[PDB]
Amino acid sequence: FACKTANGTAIPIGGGSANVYVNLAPVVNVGQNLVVDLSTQIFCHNDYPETITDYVTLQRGSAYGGVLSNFSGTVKYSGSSYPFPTTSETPRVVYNSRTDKPWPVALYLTPVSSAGGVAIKAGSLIAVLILRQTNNYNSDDFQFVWNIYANNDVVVPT
């Protein structure tokens, strides 16, 4: 089991950490959501699906910088909503193919009432999302840590 972003940035068998740069809607209105959809950038696969089934959760999610200060949010994992920062571990998603499939995580972030102007700065750390992988074969229990950075500024009008 291993993961990557499609520009080639990989986290190999056994886990590790990687950085992900996300394009963000440059204008987000109060009352509406900034959607940081990591399922369009983070992909994973099972290396031996004929023998082993892999199980993948969102173990931990938290916000940083302007996301932490200027937005409040939830995280959707595999079709369901959870508080952000996360509390419980999510249900597992099964990975059973050598063909990469997305890690189905997205943040839904709405500006706080006092937000206005440049609310997220280009280059800043905005989130850390941790994927936990286990399987039905042995005791492997690996963390894939995704450090999420803003590729661009986000402005909240007014």
H-type alpha helices, 2-157: 65-70
**Is residue 11 a contact residue for ligand FYZ (CB under 6 A)?**
no
Question: CA–CA separation, 65 vs 43, rounded Å?
Answer: 25
**Is residue 96 a contact residue for ligand FYZ (CB under 6 A)?**
no
Q: Which of residues 125-144 bind ligand FYZ (CB under 6 A)?
A: 135, 137, 140
User: Which of the ranges 17-25, 28-36, 44-52, 66-74 carries the binding residues for ligand FYZ, by CB under 6 A?
Assistant: 44-52
Question: CA–CA separation, 74 vs 39, rounded Å?
Answer: 15
SS3 of the chain: helix, strand, coil, percent, to 5: 5, 50, 45
**Is residue 13 a contact residue for ligand FYZ (CB under 6 A)?**
yes
Encoded one letter per residue, x for contact with ligand FYZ by CB under 6 A and - for no contact, window 45-64 reads: -xxx--xx-x----------
Question: CA–CA separation, 17 vs 3, rounded Å?
Answer: 10
| Residues forming the site for ligand FYZ (CB under 6 A) | 1, 13, 46-48, 51-52, 54, 135, 137, 140
